[PDB]
PDB file of C-alpha atoms in Angstrom:
ATOM      1  CA  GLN A   1      75.444  60.044 127.829  1.00 55.75           C
ATOM      2  CA  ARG A   2      73.764  56.772 126.774  1.00 53.28           C
ATOM      3  CA  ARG A   3      74.905  53.296 127.878  1.00 51.18           C
ATOM      4  CA  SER A   4      74.740  52.445 124.153  1.00 50.43           C
ATOM      5  CA  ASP A   5      77.322  55.160 123.335  1.00 51.73           C
ATOM      6  CA  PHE A   6      80.976  54.374 122.673  1.00 52.30           C
ATOM      7  CA  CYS A   7      83.528  56.612 124.448  1.00 51.69           C
ATOM      8  CA  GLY A   8      86.913  55.001 123.618  1.00 51.01           C
ATOM      9  CA  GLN A   9      89.611  56.994 121.825  1.00 50.05           C
ATOM     10  CA  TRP A  10      89.553  54.961 118.600  1.00 51.37           C
ATOM     11  CA  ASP A  11      86.146  53.266 118.899  1.00 50.89           C
ATOM     12  CA  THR A  12      84.013  52.832 115.765  1.00 53.32           C
ATOM     13  CA  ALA A  13      80.539  51.840 114.636  1.00 56.99           C
ATOM     14  CA  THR A  14      79.251  50.820 111.205  1.00 56.38           C
ATOM     15  CA  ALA A  15      75.999  51.731 109.424  1.00 52.21           C
ATOM     16  CA  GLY A  16      75.490  50.925 105.727  1.00 49.04           C
ATOM     17  CA  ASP A  17      78.526  52.277 103.862  1.00 48.94           C
ATOM     18  CA  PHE A  18      79.442  54.582 106.775  1.00 47.14           C
ATOM     19  CA  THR A  19      81.970  54.164 109.533  1.00 45.57           C
ATOM     20  CA  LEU A  20      81.370  56.416 112.539  1.00 45.74           C
ATOM     21  CA  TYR A  21      84.785  57.078 114.114  1.00 45.74           C
ATOM     22  CA  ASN A  22      85.280  58.484 117.598  1.00 44.96           C
ATOM     23  CA  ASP A  23      88.821  59.589 116.694  1.00 44.46           C
ATOM     24  CA  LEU A  24      89.490  61.383 119.995  1.00 42.68           C
ATOM     25  CA  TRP A  25      93.010  62.054 118.731  1.00 44.33           C
ATOM     26  CA  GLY A  26      93.580  65.244 120.725  1.00 39.71           C
ATOM     27  CA  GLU A  27      92.376  63.668 124.006  1.00 42.39           C
ATOM     28  CA  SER A  28      95.654  64.422 125.792  1.00 43.91           C
ATOM     29  CA  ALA A  29      95.467  68.184 125.074  1.00 43.93           C
ATOM     30  CA  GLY A  30      92.626  68.660 127.599  1.00 43.77           C
ATOM     31  CA  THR A  31      90.358  67.385 130.360  1.00 42.70           C
ATOM     32  CA  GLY A  32      87.031  65.676 129.700  1.00 41.10           C
ATOM     33  CA  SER A  33      85.434  62.910 127.642  1.00 40.54           C
ATOM     34  CA  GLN A  34      83.351  62.189 124.556  1.00 37.37           C
ATOM     35  CA  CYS A  35      80.743  59.534 123.778  1.00 37.16           C
ATOM     36  CA  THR A  36      79.103  58.744 120.450  1.00 36.37           C
ATOM     37  CA  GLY A  37      76.213  56.684 119.072  1.00 36.65           C
ATOM     38  CA  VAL A  38      74.251  55.825 115.942  1.00 39.25           C
ATOM     39  CA  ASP A  39      70.512  56.506 116.244  1.00 37.56           C
ATOM     40  CA  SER A  40      69.156  55.178 112.951  1.00 35.62           C
ATOM     41  CA  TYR A  41      70.024  54.097 109.433  1.00 39.80           C
ATOM     42  CA  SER A  42      67.191  54.312 106.895  1.00 43.69           C
ATOM     43  CA  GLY A  43      67.671  53.995 103.127  1.00 40.82           C
ATOM     44  CA  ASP A  44      71.069  55.671 102.694  1.00 41.98           C
ATOM     45  CA  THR A  45      70.598  58.166 105.559  1.00 44.87           C
ATOM     46  CA  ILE A  46      72.349  57.969 108.943  1.00 51.31           C
ATOM     47  CA  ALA A  47      71.339  59.765 112.141  1.00 53.12           C
ATOM     48  CA  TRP A  48      73.800  59.979 115.029  1.00 52.25           C
ATOM     49  CA  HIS A  49      75.052  61.995 117.969  1.00 53.40           C
ATOM     50  CA  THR A  50      78.109  62.787 120.040  1.00 52.63           C
ATOM     51  CA  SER A  51      78.203  64.353 123.502  1.00 55.61           C
ATOM     52  CA  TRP A  52      81.261  65.894 125.163  1.00 53.91           C
ATOM     53  CA  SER A  53      82.815  68.229 127.670  1.00 56.01           C
ATOM     54  CA  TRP A  54      86.357  69.520 127.016  1.00 53.31           C
ATOM     55  CA  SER A  55      88.483  72.010 128.928  1.00 52.51           C
ATOM     56  CA  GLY A  56      92.097  73.160 128.541  1.00 56.39           C
ATOM     57  CA  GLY A  57      94.183  73.373 125.364  1.00 55.70           C
ATOM     58  CA  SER A  58      91.999  76.197 124.061  1.00 57.43           C
ATOM     59  CA  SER A  59      93.532  76.253 120.559  1.00 56.64           C
ATOM     60  CA  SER A  60      93.860  72.446 120.338  1.00 53.58           C
ATOM     61  CA  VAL A  61      91.290  70.185 118.643  1.00 56.30           C
ATOM     62  CA  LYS A  62      90.356  67.341 121.005  1.00 56.10           C
ATOM     63  CA  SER A  63      88.722  65.011 118.464  1.00 56.59           C
ATOM     64  CA  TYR A  64      87.051  64.575 115.091  1.00 54.60           C
ATOM     65  CA  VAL A  65      84.026  62.342 115.621  1.00 58.25           C
ATOM     66  CA  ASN A  66      82.808  61.777 112.070  1.00 60.54           C
ATOM     67  CA  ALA A  67      80.783  59.622 109.691  1.00 61.09           C
ATOM     68  CA  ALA A  68      83.078  58.462 106.875  1.00 62.41           C
ATOM     69  CA  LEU A  69      81.890  57.076 103.527  1.00 61.09           C
ATOM     70  CA  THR A  70      83.316  53.794 102.251  1.00 61.63           C
ATOM     71  CA  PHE A  71      83.967  54.213  98.519  1.00 60.17           C
ATOM     72  CA  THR A  72      86.554  53.501  95.824  1.00 62.07           C
ATOM     73  CA  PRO A  73      89.050  56.372  95.576  1.00 63.36           C
ATOM     74  CA  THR A  74      88.236  58.230  92.354  1.00 61.76           C
ATOM     75  CA  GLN A  75      90.058  60.850  90.293  1.00 60.75           C
ATOM     76  CA  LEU A  76      88.346  64.253  90.351  1.00 59.59           C
ATOM     77  CA  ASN A  77      88.192  63.913  86.526  1.00 57.70           C
ATOM     78  CA  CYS A  78      85.880  60.937  86.815  1.00 57.47           C
ATOM     79  CA  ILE A  79      83.393  62.344  89.361  1.00 56.36           C
ATOM     80  CA  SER A  80      80.040  63.571  88.014  1.00 57.30           C
ATOM     81  CA  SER A  81      78.579  64.552  91.402  1.00 58.83           C
ATOM     82  CA  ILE A  82      78.787  64.070  95.162  1.00 59.63           C
ATOM     83  CA  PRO A  83      75.219  64.716  96.347  1.00 62.08           C
ATOM     84  CA  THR A  84      74.977  65.304 100.101  1.00 62.80           C
ATOM     85  CA  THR A  85      72.470  66.344 102.771  1.00 65.26           C
ATOM     86  CA  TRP A  86      73.329  67.259 106.364  1.00 66.62           C
ATOM     87  CA  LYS A  87      70.990  68.378 109.110  1.00 62.35           C
ATOM     88  CA  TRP A  88      72.350  68.948 112.609  1.00 62.70           C
ATOM     89  CA  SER A  89      72.132  71.061 115.753  1.00 60.21           C
ATOM     90  CA  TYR A  90      74.384  71.817 118.751  1.00 60.17           C
ATOM     91  CA  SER A  91      73.421  72.128 122.413  1.00 57.73           C
ATOM     92  CA  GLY A  92      75.714  72.980 125.342  1.00 60.13           C
ATOM     93  CA  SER A  93      77.482  75.990 126.860  1.00 61.53           C
ATOM     94  CA  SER A  94      80.629  77.925 125.888  1.00 59.57           C
ATOM     95  CA  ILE A  95      80.957  75.761 122.771  1.00 56.85           C
ATOM     96  CA  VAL A  96      84.131  76.378 120.782  1.00 57.48           C
ATOM     97  CA  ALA A  97      83.974  73.912 117.895  1.00 56.67           C
ATOM     98  CA  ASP A  98      83.339  73.371 114.206  1.00 59.97           C
ATOM     99  CA  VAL A  99      80.923  71.235 112.227  1.00 61.12           C
ATOM    100  CA  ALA A 100      82.691  70.277 109.009  1.00 60.25           C
ATOM    101  CA  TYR A 101      83.196  67.982 106.074  1.00 56.54           C
ATOM    102  CA  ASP A 102      86.792  66.771 105.938  1.00 54.36           C
ATOM    103  CA  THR A 103      88.126  65.440 102.627  1.00 50.48           C
ATOM    104  CA  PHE A 104      91.534  64.525 101.197  1.00 49.18           C
ATOM    105  CA  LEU A 105      93.191  64.319  97.775  1.00 50.94           C
ATOM    106  CA  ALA A 106      96.225  62.188  96.887  1.00 50.69           C
ATOM    107  CA  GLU A 107      98.288  61.337  93.788  1.00 53.31           C
ATOM    108  CA  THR A 108      97.302  57.657  94.057  1.00 55.21           C
ATOM    109  CA  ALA A 109      94.238  55.745  95.316  1.00 52.17           C
ATOM    110  CA  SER A 110      95.773  54.843  98.695  1.00 53.98           C
ATOM    111  CA  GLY A 111      98.440  57.566  98.666  1.00 51.65           C
ATOM    112  CA  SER A 112      99.549  60.251 101.100  1.00 51.68           C
ATOM    113  CA  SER A 113      97.404  63.406 101.028  1.00 49.77           C
ATOM    114  CA  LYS A 114      98.532  66.393  98.938  1.00 51.28           C
ATOM    115  CA  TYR A 115      95.439  68.398  99.953  1.00 53.00           C
ATOM    116  CA  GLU A 116      92.970  68.530 102.810  1.00 52.66           C
ATOM    117  CA  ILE A 117      89.700  70.237 101.885  1.00 51.98           C
ATOM    118  CA  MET A 118      87.236  71.195 104.640  1.00 52.11           C
ATOM    119  CA  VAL A 119      83.717  72.598 104.407  1.00 54.56           C
ATOM    120  CA  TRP A 120      82.620  74.145 107.723  1.00 57.83           C
ATOM    121  CA  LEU A 121      78.874  74.398 108.258  1.00 59.62           C
ATOM    122  CA  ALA A 122      79.626  76.011 111.628  1.00 59.55           C
ATOM    123  CA  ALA A 123      82.460  77.903 113.296  1.00 60.45           C
ATOM    124  CA  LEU A 124      81.280  78.210 116.896  1.00 59.16           C
ATOM    125  CA  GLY A 125      82.767  80.256 119.739  1.00 61.50           C
ATOM    126  CA  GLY A 126      85.570  81.764 117.638  1.00 63.37           C
ATOM    127  CA  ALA A 127      86.870  78.480 116.196  1.00 60.87           C
ATOM    128  CA  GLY A 128      88.910  79.219 113.055  1.00 62.53           C
ATOM    129  CA  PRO A 129      90.648  77.253 110.285  1.00 63.60           C
ATOM    130  CA  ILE A 130      94.295  76.925 109.255  1.00 65.89           C
ATOM    131  CA  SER A 131      95.312  80.144 107.493  1.00 62.88           C
ATOM    132  CA  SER A 132      98.690  81.342 106.179  1.00 61.91           C
ATOM    133  CA  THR A 133      97.678  85.019 106.175  1.00 60.97           C
ATOM    134  CA  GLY A 134      94.835  85.161 108.703  1.00 62.48           C
ATOM    135  CA  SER A 135      92.561  86.444 105.903  1.00 61.86           C
ATOM    136  CA  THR A 136      90.446  84.879 103.157  1.00 64.41           C
ATOM    137  CA  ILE A 137      91.857  83.951  99.750  1.00 70.75           C
ATOM    138  CA  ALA A 138      88.359  84.006  98.218  1.00 75.60           C
ATOM    139  CA  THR A 139      84.709  84.506  99.202  1.00 74.90           C
ATOM    140  CA  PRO A 140      82.711  82.243  96.843  1.00 72.72           C
ATOM    141  CA  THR A 141      79.031  81.285  96.849  1.00 73.14           C
ATOM    142  CA  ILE A 142      78.683  77.496  96.470  1.00 71.66           C
ATOM    143  CA  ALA A 143      75.826  75.063  97.225  1.00 71.14           C
ATOM    144  CA  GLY A 144      73.475  77.835  98.415  1.00 70.44           C
ATOM    145  CA  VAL A 145      75.926  79.177 101.007  1.00 68.61           C
ATOM    146  CA  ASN A 146      78.304  82.163 101.088  1.00 67.87           C
ATOM    147  CA  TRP A 147      81.794  80.938 102.025  1.00 68.78           C
ATOM    148  CA  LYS A 148      84.992  82.383 103.396  1.00 67.17           C
ATOM    149  CA  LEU A 149      87.840  80.365 101.865  1.00 68.87           C
ATOM    150  CA  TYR A 150      91.173  80.041 103.703  1.00 66.26           C
ATOM    151  CA  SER A 151      94.378  78.124 102.971  1.00 68.12           C
ATOM    152  CA  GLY A 152      97.353  77.079 105.068  1.00 67.59           C
ATOM    153  CA  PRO A 153      99.998  74.369 105.343  1.00 71.98           C
ATOM    154  CA  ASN A 154     100.066  71.219 107.417  1.00 69.94           C
ATOM    155  CA  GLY A 155     103.529  69.983 106.510  1.00 69.96           C
ATOM    156  CA  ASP A 156     103.419  68.471 103.012  1.00 72.15           C
ATOM    157  CA  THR A 157      99.622  68.873 102.812  1.00 72.24           C
ATOM    158  CA  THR A 158      97.843  72.098 101.831  1.00 72.90           C
ATOM    159  CA  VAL A 159      94.636  72.690 103.821  1.00 75.19           C
ATOM    160  CA  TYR A 160      91.745  74.549 102.162  1.00 76.63           C
ATOM    161  CA  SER A 161      88.847  75.439 104.474  1.00 74.26           C
ATOM    162  CA  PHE A 162      85.528  76.819 103.211  1.00 75.41           C
ATOM    163  CA  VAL A 163      83.841  78.463 106.225  1.00 75.87           C
ATOM    164  CA  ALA A 164      80.153  79.394 105.994  1.00 78.56           C
ATOM    165  CA  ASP A 165      79.390  83.075 106.656  1.00 77.82           C
ATOM    166  CA  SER A 166      76.479  81.990 108.868  1.00 74.75           C
ATOM    167  CA  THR A 167      75.901  78.811 110.882  1.00 74.34           C
ATOM    168  CA  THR A 168      74.165  76.407 108.500  1.00 69.95           C
ATOM    169  CA  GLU A 169      72.115  73.738 110.320  1.00 71.28           C
ATOM    170  CA  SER A 170      70.482  72.450 107.123  1.00 72.62           C
ATOM    171  CA  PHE A 171      72.856  71.976 104.206  1.00 70.07           C
ATOM    172  CA  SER A 172      72.498  70.273 100.856  1.00 69.85           C
ATOM    173  CA  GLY A 173      74.367  70.319  97.560  1.00 68.40           C
ATOM    174  CA  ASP A 174      76.962  68.749  95.314  1.00 67.18           C
ATOM    175  CA  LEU A 175      80.188  68.559  97.332  1.00 64.09           C
ATOM    176  CA  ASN A 176      82.096  68.181  94.037  1.00 63.20           C
ATOM    177  CA  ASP A 177      81.365  71.883  93.384  1.00 63.50           C
ATOM    178  CA  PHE A 178      84.024  72.667  96.028  1.00 66.60           C
ATOM    179  CA  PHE A 179      86.630  70.500  94.277  1.00 67.49           C
ATOM    180  CA  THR A 180      85.658  71.990  90.909  1.00 67.12           C
ATOM    181  CA  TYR A 181      86.117  75.472  92.411  1.00 67.56           C
ATOM    182  CA  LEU A 182      89.672  74.692  93.594  1.00 69.02           C
ATOM    183  CA  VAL A 183      90.553  73.007  90.283  1.00 66.08           C
ATOM    184  CA  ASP A 184      89.395  76.117  88.377  1.00 68.92           C
ATOM    185  CA  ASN A 185      90.656  78.788  90.815  1.00 69.06           C
ATOM    186  CA  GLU A 186      93.444  77.427  93.061  1.00 68.69           C
ATOM    187  CA  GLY A 187      95.493  75.212  90.721  1.00 67.83           C
ATOM    188  CA  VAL A 188      94.402  71.876  92.208  1.00 70.14           C
ATOM    189  CA  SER A 189      95.048  68.998  89.774  1.00 70.43           C
ATOM    190  CA  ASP A 190      91.872  67.209  88.621  1.00 71.44           C
ATOM    191  CA  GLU A 191      93.946  64.024  88.160  1.00 76.20           C
ATOM    192  CA  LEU A 192      94.244  63.676  91.959  1.00 77.16           C
ATOM    193  CA  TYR A 193      92.312  60.928  93.748  1.00 76.78           C
ATOM    194  CA  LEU A 194      89.555  61.768  96.215  1.00 77.08           C
ATOM    195  CA  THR A 195      90.359  59.287  99.006  1.00 77.40           C
ATOM    196  CA  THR A 196      88.252  60.462 101.957  1.00 77.14           C
ATOM    197  CA  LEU A 197      84.758  61.867 102.559  1.00 79.14           C
ATOM    198  CA  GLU A 198      84.014  62.588 106.221  1.00 78.86           C
ATOM    199  CA  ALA A 199      81.411  64.685 108.037  1.00 76.22           C
ATOM    200  CA  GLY A 200      81.642  65.444 111.760  1.00 73.19           C
ATOM    201  CA  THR A 201      82.725  67.920 114.445  1.00 72.95           C
ATOM    202  CA  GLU A 202      86.026  69.245 115.860  1.00 74.01           C
ATOM    203  CA  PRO A 203      85.597  70.364 119.488  1.00 75.18           C
ATOM    204  CA  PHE A 204      88.104  72.670 121.185  1.00 77.37           C
ATOM    205  CA  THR A 205      86.424  73.492 124.514  1.00 79.26           C
ATOM    206  CA  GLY A 206      82.913  73.486 125.987  1.00 77.65           C
ATOM    207  CA  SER A 207      80.628  72.064 128.656  1.00 74.74           C
ATOM    208  CA  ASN A 208      77.692  69.624 128.513  1.00 74.79           C
ATOM    209  CA  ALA A 209      77.785  69.727 124.697  1.00 74.12           C
ATOM    210  CA  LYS A 210      75.946  67.532 122.197  1.00 72.56           C
ATOM    211  CA  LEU A 211      75.913  67.443 118.407  1.00 68.09           C
ATOM    212  CA  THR A 212      72.697  65.897 117.136  1.00 68.34           C
ATOM    213  CA  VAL A 213      72.917  64.826 113.492  1.00 68.15           C
ATOM    214  CA  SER A 214      69.278  64.247 112.513  1.00 64.85           C
ATOM    215  CA  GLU A 215      70.025  63.542 108.842  1.00 65.22           C
ATOM    216  CA  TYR A 216      73.209  62.798 106.904  1.00 64.42           C
ATOM    217  CA  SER A 217      73.728  61.273 103.469  1.00 66.45           C
ATOM    218  CA  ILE A 218      76.431  61.402 100.812  1.00 64.73           C
ATOM    219  CA  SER A 219      77.276  59.425  97.680  1.00 63.96           C
ATOM    220  CA  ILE A 220      79.639  59.580  94.706  1.00 60.57           C
ATOM    221  CA  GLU A 221      78.504  59.284  91.094  1.00 62.19           C
TER     222      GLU A 221
END
């Protein structure tokens, strides 16, 4: 833990067009704490970290510390690409957590989400996504990675989660390829607005853990 870190439930920091949210929303489901800090911002690339220990509520996400892009909500129709690079590593013991993009689609620019679309670069310690059946709905290769695609409900929002077959500490590609996949193969409307582009980690449980994000960038064209 650094004295420069922020550890409050809803604390934020800003770097370029990113907001780094602590978003310790599942705090009450366990015992522990989580502190977060920006390390650098160079060009359009952010580097940051978050350290935590969480125990109890084994199946309950404790937080989603994430870097979120500020952008104008745009219809999938109007997106040419979403180039992104993400380099990270995890330290700690008994880590049950994911490292994932979290994105949302709505019928209007500032509307309620019809879909949540996740891209998991890591599923650590048995962490698993929302799934109606408990099995994949597809196993596509996208952005140089072999994925296991799952779907499941969260009330009025459908959650799609692409989970990498292997932990991917260095990822790069066009994130729009995932939206294009779902438009072509899972009946997602390309008239929907992309409202949210986030990249972070969901911890369940673990001790003396730290996500180091050495490089992250994303933009919409």
